[PDB]
């Protein structure tokens, strides 16, 4: 699974909760079950469809 962890919590534009804020972390599995790419960086929401 993938876990994203932070301190700030915010709600989305439509009002549902979910945004977060400042420095945060997420881990990502890949390699069909071998690759654990882990970081604590900063997100940047994209504004497309």
């Amino acid at each position: 699974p993938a876990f994203m962890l932070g301190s700030s919590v915010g709600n989305f534009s439509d009002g549902k909760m979910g945004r977060f804020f400042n420095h945060t972390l997420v881990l990502l599995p890949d390699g069909c079950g071998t690759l654990l790419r882990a970081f604590y960086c900063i997100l940047e929401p994209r504004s497309g469809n």
Binding site: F39, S47, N49
Partner: protein
């Protein structure tokens, strides 16, 4: 202080919200006597002996936050 690419144009694949199908059950609580996911003493080891320890644990018999993933819609290929 890092480097890494970016993927595509800003057009996300269409995600739905269909938790109603995902809200099924497979009840499996935890068991410390089955040693179900408990941290080992991180500092030192022992042998063939029984010791108390103050540590971070779950409550015994909790039902947890079970989730599951699944594939999306598809037609043929």
């Amino acid at each position: 202080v890092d480097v890494g690419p970016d993927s595509v144009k800003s057009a996300c694949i269409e995600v739905d919200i269909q938790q109603t199908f995902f809200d099924k059950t497979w009840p499996r609580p935890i068991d410390v006597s089955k040693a179900d996911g408990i941290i080992y003493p991180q500092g030192r080891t022992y042998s063939n002996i029984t010791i108390t320890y103050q540590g971070l644990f779950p409550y015994q018999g909790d039902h947890g936050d079970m989730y599951v993933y699944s594939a999306g819609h598809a037609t043929g290929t």
